[PDB]
Amino acid sequence: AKSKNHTAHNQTRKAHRNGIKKPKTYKYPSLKGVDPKFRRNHKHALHGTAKALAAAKK
Amino acid sequence: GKSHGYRSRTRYMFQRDFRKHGAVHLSTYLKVYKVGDIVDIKANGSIQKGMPHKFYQGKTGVVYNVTKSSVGVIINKMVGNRYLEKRLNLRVEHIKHSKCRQEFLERVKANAAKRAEAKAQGVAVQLKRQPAQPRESRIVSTEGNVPQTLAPVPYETFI
Amino acid sequence: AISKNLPILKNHFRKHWQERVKVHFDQAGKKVSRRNARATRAAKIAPRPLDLLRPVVRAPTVKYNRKVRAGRGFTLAEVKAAGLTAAYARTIGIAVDHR
Amino acid sequence: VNVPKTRKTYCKGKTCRKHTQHKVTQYKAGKASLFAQGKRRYDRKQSGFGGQTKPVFHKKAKTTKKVVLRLECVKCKTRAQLTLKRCKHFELGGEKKQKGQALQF
RNA sequence: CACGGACCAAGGAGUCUAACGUCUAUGCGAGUGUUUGGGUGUAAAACCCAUACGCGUAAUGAAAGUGAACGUAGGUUGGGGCCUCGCAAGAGGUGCACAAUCGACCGAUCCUGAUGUCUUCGGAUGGAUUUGAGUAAGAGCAUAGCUGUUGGGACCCGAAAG
RNA sequence: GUCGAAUUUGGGUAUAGGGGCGAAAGACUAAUCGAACCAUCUAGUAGCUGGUUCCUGCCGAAGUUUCCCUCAGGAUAGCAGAAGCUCGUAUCAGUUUUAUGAGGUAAAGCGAAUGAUUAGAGGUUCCGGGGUCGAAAUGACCUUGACCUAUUCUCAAACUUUAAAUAUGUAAGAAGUCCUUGUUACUUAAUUGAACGUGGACAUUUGAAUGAAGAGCUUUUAGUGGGCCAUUUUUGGUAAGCAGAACUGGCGAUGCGGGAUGAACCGAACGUAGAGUUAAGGUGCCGGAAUACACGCUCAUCAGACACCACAAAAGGUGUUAG
RNA sequence: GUGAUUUCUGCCCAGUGCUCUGAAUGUCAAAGUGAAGAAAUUCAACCAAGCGCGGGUAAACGGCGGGAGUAACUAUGACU
RNA sequence: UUGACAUUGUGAAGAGACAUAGUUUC
RNA sequence: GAAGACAUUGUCAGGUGGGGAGUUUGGCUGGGGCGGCACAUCUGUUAAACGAUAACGCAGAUGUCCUAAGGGGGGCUCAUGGAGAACAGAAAUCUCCAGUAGAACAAAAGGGUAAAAGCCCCCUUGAUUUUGAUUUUCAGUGUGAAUACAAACCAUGAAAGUGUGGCCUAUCGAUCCUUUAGUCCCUCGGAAUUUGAGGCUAGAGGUGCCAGAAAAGUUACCACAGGGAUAACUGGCUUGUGGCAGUCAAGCGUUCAUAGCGACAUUGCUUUUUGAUUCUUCGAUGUCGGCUCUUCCUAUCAUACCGAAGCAGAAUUCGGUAA
RNA sequence: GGUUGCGGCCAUAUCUACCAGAAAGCACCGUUUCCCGUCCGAUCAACUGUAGUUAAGCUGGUAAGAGCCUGACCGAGUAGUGUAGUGGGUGACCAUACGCGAAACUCAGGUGCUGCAAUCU
Numbered sequence A: 001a002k003s004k005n006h007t008a009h010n011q012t013r014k015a016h017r018n019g020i021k022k023p024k025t026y027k028y029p030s031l032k033g034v035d036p037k038f039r040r041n042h043k044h045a046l047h048g049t050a051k052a053l054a055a056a057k058k
Numbered sequence B: 001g002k003s004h005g006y007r008s009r010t011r012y013m014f015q016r017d018f019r020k021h022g023a024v025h026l027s028t029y030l031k032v033y034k035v036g037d038i039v040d041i042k043a044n045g046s047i048q049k050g051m052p053h054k055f056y057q058g059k060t061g062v063v064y065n066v067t068k069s070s071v072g073v074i075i076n077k078m079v080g081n082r083y084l085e086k087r088l089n090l091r092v093e094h095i096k097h098s099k100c101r102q103e104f105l106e107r108v109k110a111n112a113a114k115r116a117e118a119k120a121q122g123v124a125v126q127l128k129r130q131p132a133q134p135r136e137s138r139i140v141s142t143e144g145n146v147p148q149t150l151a152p153v154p155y156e157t158f159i
Numbered sequence C: 001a002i003s004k005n006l007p008i009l010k011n012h013f014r015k016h017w018q019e020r021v022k023v024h025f026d027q028a029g030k031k032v033s034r035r036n037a038r039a040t041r042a043a044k045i046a047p048r049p050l051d052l053l054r055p056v057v058r059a060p061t062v063k064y065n066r067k068v069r070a071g072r073g074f075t076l077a078e079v080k081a082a083g084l085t086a087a088y089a090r091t092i093g094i095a096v097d098h099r
Numbered sequence D: 001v002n003v004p005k006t007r008k009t010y011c012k013g014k015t016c017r018k019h020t021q022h023k024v025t026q027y028k029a030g031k032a033s034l035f036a037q038g039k040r041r042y043d044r045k046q047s048g049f050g051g052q053t054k055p056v057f058h059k060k061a062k063t064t065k066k067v068v069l070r071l072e073c074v075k076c077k078t079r080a081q082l083t084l085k086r087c088k089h090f091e092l093g094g095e096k097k098q099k100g101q102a103l104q105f
Numbered sequence E: 001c002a003c004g005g006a007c008c009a010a011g012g013a014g015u016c017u018a019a020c021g022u023c024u025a026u027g028c029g030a031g032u033g034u035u036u037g038g039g040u041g042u043a044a045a046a047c048c049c050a051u052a053c054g055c056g057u058a059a060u061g062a063a064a065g066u067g068a069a070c071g072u073a074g075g076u077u078g079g080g081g082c083c084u085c086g087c088a089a090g091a092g093g094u095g096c097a098c099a100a101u102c103g104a105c106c107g108a109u110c111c112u113g114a115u116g117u118c119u120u121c122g123g124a125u126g127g128a129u130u131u132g133a134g135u136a137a138g139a140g141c142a143u144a145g146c147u148g149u150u151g152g153g154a155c156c157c158g159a160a161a162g
Numbered sequence F: 001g002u003c004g005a006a007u008u009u010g011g012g013u014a015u016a017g018g019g020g021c022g023a024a025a026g027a028c029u030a031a032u033c034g035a036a037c038c039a040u041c042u043a044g045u046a047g048c049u050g051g052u053u054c055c056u057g058c059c060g061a062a063g064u065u066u067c068c069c070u071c072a073g074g075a076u077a078g079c080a081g082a083a084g085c086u087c088g089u090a091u092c093a094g095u096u097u098u099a100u101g102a103g104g105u106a107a108a109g110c111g112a113a114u115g116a117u118u119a120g121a122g123g124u125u126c127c128g129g130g131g132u133c134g135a136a137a138u139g140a141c142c143u144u145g146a147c148c149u150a151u152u153c154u155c156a157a158a159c160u161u162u163a164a165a166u167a168u169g170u171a172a173g174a175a176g177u178c179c180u181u182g183u184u185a186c187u188u189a190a191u192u193g194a195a196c197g198u199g200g201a202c203a204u205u206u207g208a209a210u211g212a213a214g215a216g217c218u219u220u221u222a223g224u225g226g227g228c229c230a231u232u233u234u235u236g237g238u239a240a241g242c243a244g245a246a247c248u249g250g251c252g253a254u255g256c257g258g259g260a261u262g263a264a265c266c267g268a269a270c271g272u273a274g275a276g277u278u279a280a281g282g283u284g285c286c287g288g289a290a291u292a293c294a295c296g297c298u299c300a301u302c303a304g305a306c307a308c309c310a311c312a313a314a315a316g317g318u319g320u321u322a323g
Numbered sequence G: 001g002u003g004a005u006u007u008c009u010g011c012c013c014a015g016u017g018c019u020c021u022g023a024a025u026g027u028c029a030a031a032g033u034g035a036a037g038a039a040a041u042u043c044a045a046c047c048a049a050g051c052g053c054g055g056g057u058a059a060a061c062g063g064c065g066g067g068a069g070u071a072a073c074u075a076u077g078a079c080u
Numbered sequence H: 001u002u003g004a005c006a007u008u009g010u011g012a013a014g015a016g017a018c019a020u021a022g023u024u025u026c
Numbered sequence I: 001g002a003a004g005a006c007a008u009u010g011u012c013a014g015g016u017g018g019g020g021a022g023u024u025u026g027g028c029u030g031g032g033g034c035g036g037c038a039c040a041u042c043u044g045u046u047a048a049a050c051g052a053u054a055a056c057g058c059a060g061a062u063g064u065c066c067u068a069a070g071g072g073g074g075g076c077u078c079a080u081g082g083a084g085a086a087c088a089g090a091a092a093u094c095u096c097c098a099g100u101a102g103a104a105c106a107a108a109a110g111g112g113u114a115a116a117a118g119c120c121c122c123c124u125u126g127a128u129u130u131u132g133a134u135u136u137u138c139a140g141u142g143u144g145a146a147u148a149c150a151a152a153c154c155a156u157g158a159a160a161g162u163g164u165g166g167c168c169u170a171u172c173g174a175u176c177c178u179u180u181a182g183u184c185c186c187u188c189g190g191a192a193u194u195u196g197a198g199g200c201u202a203g204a205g206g207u208g209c210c211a212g213a214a215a216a217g218u219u220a221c222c223a224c225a226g227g228g229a230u231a232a233c234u235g236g237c238u239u240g241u242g243g244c245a246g247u248c249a250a251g252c253g254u255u256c257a258u259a260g261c262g263a264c265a266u267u268g269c270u271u272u273u274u275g276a277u278u279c280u281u282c283g284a285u286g287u288c289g290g291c292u293c294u295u296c297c298u299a300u301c302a303u304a305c306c307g308a309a310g311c312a313g314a315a316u317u318c319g320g321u322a323a
Numbered sequence J: 001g002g003u004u005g006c007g008g009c010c011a012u013a014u015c016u017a018c019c020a021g022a023a024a025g026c027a028c029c030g031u032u033u034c035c036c037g038u039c040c041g042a043u044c045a046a047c048u049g050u051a052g053u054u055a056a057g058c059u060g061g062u063a064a065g066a067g068c069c070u071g072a073c074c075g076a077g078u079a080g081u082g083u084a085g086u087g088g089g090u091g092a093c094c095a096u097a098c099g100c101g102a103a104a105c106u107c108a109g110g111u112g113c114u115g116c117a118a119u120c121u
Ligand SMILES: C/C(=C\[C@H](C)C(=O)C[C@H](O)CC1CC(=O)NC(=O)C1)[C@@H]1OC(=O)/C=C/CC/C=C\C=C\[C@@H]1C
Pocket: D054, D055, D056, D057, I175, I176, I177, I205, I206
C-alpha cells in the first residue's frame, strides 16, 4: 500500500494567509552572545555615567 | 539513502574562483568591523574554520559582536511563515563591508549639502529621487542624415 | 490520549467505582435525627448536662502546641488535688483519664 | 591505538590545580554489590511466582566500547576520567611508530 | 455494473459525574470559601454561626538550609490620558497599562574568605558567558456558563476470544 | 454392501468439557465439536465498519512539517473559528523602481583543463617489435607501432574557462545626519580607542514608485494530516488513463455560460429581482443568431468539417494548385 | 511399531534420544564447615543428583558420498 | 528426582576434637 | 508375622519436566513473500544557477583508523619527463634541467592546500579544566557534529601567534538500573559514633527497527474486524514482447534487384500472446475444458469472376472484387 | 627619474629569445678564529668590506612572439529565456506577440599601476 511521499504543493498558500511577517525590529536589541569581557566593562561604564548624571542633579 | 551533511551540495559554491587560489591577500585582514556595520557573507573555501553554512552564502546582515578573529552577524531567516533571528560567528575571511549602503550614505551627505545650498540662498530644492520619466519632444534633423530604406531579406542557406 | 498544554491529572476512576458512591441526601434527615437524639437524651438525663467536664491540655507537636484545647479527662493527680477521688468524680459529671 | 602510560595534564584538586604528571590506566567496571537499592528492589520483585519480571536485552549491535582512562595525579593523588573514541584494539603499553624502516625478512 | 434503504407509525445516538485549561458574568478582595458540624425553622427549603481546614498572600535547593529596596522600589526608548503655553498648528511637563533593553534584590552553583574561635568551628564582604515555575507598592478566593482535557459502559450499535 | 456373527437390538448401569469416548474421521459427546450447553464477570476491548435527529446568518479548511512497533492511528507545527485587547496616519505589502550583493542552471566551449572521439600531415628514438645488408655496431636503409608538433570531424547528469533569463539577500533616514566632550575595571605607547551617554544644529520633496475597508498583539480550541488534475520544468519506464519530484493555477469543497456528453479545459465564481451590454462559444435546420459579404483551394466507388479530444506513419501519385 | 502366508530383513552408535556392574578431582544448590569482620556481610573449602567424560543400543528417531583415470575401432569400464 | 532440616529413640564396635581421661559428631 | 528409626510424611534447595499453562513470533515494499535497505547517516549527481525538494533513481561511501595520522616550530618541494654516471638490465643508487600541482594529505567523493595543509626533522599532550551562547538537521525539542567568545592551566616558537583532537563535508545513543570519578558536601526523620545505604556533579556499561519493546513456528481443521487504500479473474490505458503489414533495394533467383523472395536499416498496424499498470468489483459480477446454440469480424482455407508468373499442357504460386 | 628596505592591488606584473644599463644601491664575491649547521662552510652561521666583477641576479628595451588585460552596432538583437493565444503541425517540433538577453568568433588598443621611508649624477 504505497502513498505520496512528499510535496510543497500548497505550502506557500498557507504561509501567506497570516502572511510571512517581516522580522520585527527593536531599538536596543539584546546583547545576547556578546563578548563577556566587553559586557563586564560596559556594565561598569554605564554605572559610572549614570552616577555622573544623578550627580549633575544634586 | 539520502545524504544531507553540512557542506552538502556546495561543490561549486565554496570553490575558489579561476586563477585565484592560495593565501588570501592581507587587505582582508586589515579591514575593520564595528557593531552596526552591514556585511555581505560569502565563504572562502580555503578557510575551513569559521565558515558560514551555505544557507547564508549570498546573504547580508548586521554586525552585533566583534571578537578576536571574528564578527558575529545577525541574519533574519524565514522558516514557516515567519522570520527568526539568527546569529553567525564568522571569521573575517567570509565577510566584506557591504556597499548596499554607500548610495545612501553618499546620498545623505549630498542631500545635506544642496539643502544648505538652497536654504542659505532662498530655497526651492526638490531632493527625492524620481523614476525614469518619459522622453520630452525633440526635432530630429535630416541634414547629413537622410533616412536609409531597408526591406526584409530573402531566404538563403550558407553551408 | 495526551494532547494540548494541560495539567497532568490523576483521576482514580479505574475500578468499579460507581458501586461505592455515597451521596449524602440524608444530610437534613440526619441533622434532624441528631437533634431529636439530643432533645431526648436531655430529657432522660433529668437535670444533668449533656456532657462531661473536660480538662485543659496543651496540644501536641510544633504546629499546634501554641494552642490549648479540651483534653479527654482529668488525671488521678488533678482529681486528687481538687480534693476528690476518681470513682466519685466520675459520678459527679467530671471526666477522668488514668492515661 | 596506543596511548602513553603517562600524561602531563590538568589536575583539578584544591592543592594541585595545575598541570601535573598523571599515571594513565584503563577503567574496569567494578563488582556489583547486592544491597544497591536496585538489586534490592529487583530481588524482591523477582520472588514468588510470575516469572521474569523485568526486560532482558538481546538485540546487541555494537562491537566496541568506548575506552576510559583513569588518570592519577602523582602529587595530590586525585583522579580524572577521560573517555576515548570507539576503537577495536587498545593498548597503553609502549611500542611507538618508527621513522622509516624496512619490512622484516 | 460500489454498500444500506419494499412501505408506515412509534422508539432511536456527545450524556452525567470526579478533577481540570482558556474565556466570560457575579460577589467579596490580601484575602476568600455560611451548608463536616452547630443554631433555628412556616422542616430536605429559607435564615444564623464558633473553631478549624483549603486555596492565595514566597521563593529556591536532592537536601541540611537560607530567604526578596544602593536608588523617589532604579536607568534608557516608545507610550494613551492628563497638565502648561499658544487663536490655531504646534511646543514643553508628567507619564499608569503594555512593550523592548540595561541594572539591583532572594534561593541554587562556583569563587572570594574580614572581625572572631571550645583550631575547626564561623562565613562578614566583594564577585562570576552559570542557574530558578522568584522580588522589584500584592490578585486572589468562591459560585455559575459555553468550549476543550483525562478517568468512567463515556455519542449509539458490533468480534474471533478470556 | 453385508446377512450366524469383531451380528442386530430394548431396558438398566458407568464415564462429563482441556474432560469423556474413539477398530482413529479431529470423529462423537441431545440439529451444537480443532474444546458442549447454561448463567454470570459483560454495556469485555476495537487504530476497524455502519449510523448520528430543527432553521437561517457570518467566517472557512487539510491531505503538508517533525517524532512515534510509525505506514487505515496518534502527538507536533501549519491551515480555521472564536474571544477580544492595545493603538491609529499609523505602521503595512505574494508589486515596481533605484543602488549594492549571491548563484553555476539554459546557452556555450573542446585548434582551453579533465574525460571521450573521426581523419590525415610533418617530426623524434643508442631505446617496442618485425625485415634487407651484415662478423657486429651506441650501424645504414625500409617497416609498423607508439610518443611529439601544428591541423582536423564529433561529444558530457555525475567536464569546463566564460555565462544568462526566471527566481533570490540587503538598503532607500528622526531608531537619521553633523558639532561639543562625560563614563569604564575593556582596550591603547598614549584620555588612545571601543561601547553607552550629556549639551547643541537641521522638519515633512524627511529623502523613490504604487497601494493600504488600518496596524500591532494575546489566548484558546475544531476539522485535517489517503489527495487528485492542467500548462511549464522534470526522474524512472518501450509505453501507460503508469510511478515519482518542482513552481503556479485548479478539482476535491462549486453551482452558472461554452466544449453535444464529461470532477479538473475555455469563460466566468453565485443574496432576491428589473433593464441593458458582453465573455468563451456560436448564427442552413434541429436552435436563440447573416442559406452575410470577400479572394482562393478541394471532388474522395470508405472526402472533410475546429483547441484539451477521443490518433495515424515512412513511402508514393503524369489528380489539381501555386512556386 | 509392523501388519495373513511364503521369502528376506544388509552396512551405520558420529548426531538426537534411550540406557549402564563404568569412571572422577572439570562443573556444581539450600543446610552444614572454615576464615576475616564490631556485627550486617564478604571470601573460601568441602559437596547430592544432574551435566561433562567413558561404555551399550537401529524391528529407537533416523542415515546409507564426491572427483579423476584405465581393455589392440568405437563404446563400456571388471581394475586403479 | 536429588540433598538438608523436622518426625527420631536405644546399644555396641570404629573413626572424628579441648590438643593419649569422654561431653560431642559422623 | 514382616519392616524399622531406615521407609513414609511435612518444609525449603538443585536437577528434570510441550504432560500442561500463559505469551510472543519487526517495518518499508509497484499485492504479499524471497531479496535488498531507499529504517541512523556521508560525497557527487538527479535538483530546474539562493534555500528546500521524491522514487526499491544514478556512481560510491559509514558502525572504523591514528600518541601521531593530535599540537607548535624550522627546513624543504611534489607527479612526470629529459639529458647524463662501473657491474646495472624496462625497474637499484648518484647528478643536473624542466615541472600550477599533472602528487601527497587513513578512508568514499567533492572542496581545499606550494617558503603549505604535502616530505624531512626538533620540542610536546590544547585529544586538558569550568560552565554558558551560536550554526546544521528543527518543533526553531533532543541527539550527533561543528563555530566564535569568557574564566583557567599548559604546549610550542626569537616572536607575532597558533593549539578546546585528526584540513573541511559522515564515523553514532534517552528514562530506570549498575559501575566509576568528584566534594569530604547533604540525608538516614528520638540523640549520637562507626560500618552500610541513600542524594548531588560528571563519565562508562545500549538500545544499528539507530527518539531507544524482553520474544519461535504451523494451520488445507481454522476464526474475527476490515480492505476493492491490496493480489488472483472480466473489463480500461499501454504495446516492450507475441502476431500481422509496409518503405529503401545490397543480395537470392543459370543470366536478370522487385516472376517469387529479400540483408543492413527503417515506418507502422493488431489487441485470441505475454508482460507493465492497479481504475472498477473483496456486505461476492461462481475457474479450465467440453456439450448445445446464435450472431458477428476478416488478416479468405474451400466455393463464383478475375489480373501475374521463371503460366507449354496438367499441377502450383502471387495478386484483386469477395465473409 | 634610478635604487633599496617594508609594502597594497596580485600576469598590462607571467613565459620564450635577444640586446642595453651611467651614478648610487643591491648582487655576485674573499675568509673560517668566534656563535651556529652541514655527508659537503653549496645552503645555513659568523668575520672582512678588505682582495675581485657587471658574467649572472636586478632593471629596462626589442618581437606582424605564446599568455594575460581592455574595448567595439565584430559576431548577435543570434543562442537561451520570463509572459500570451481554442496559434501551426500526426508528431518531432516550429512561427508569432510584450519583454530580458549570452558565450565563442572577428577586429582594434595595451603589457604593471602605486603607498611609506632612506639614498643617488
Ligand atoms: C544493556 C545493558 C546495559 C545498558 C547500557 C542499559 O542501560 C540497559 C538498560 O538498563 C535497560 C533498562 C532501561 C529501563 O529504563 N528499564 C528497563 O527495564 C530496562 C545491560 O547489558 C549489559 O551490560 C551487557 C549485556 C549482554 C547481554 C546480557 C544482559 C543484559 C543486561 C543489561 C540490560
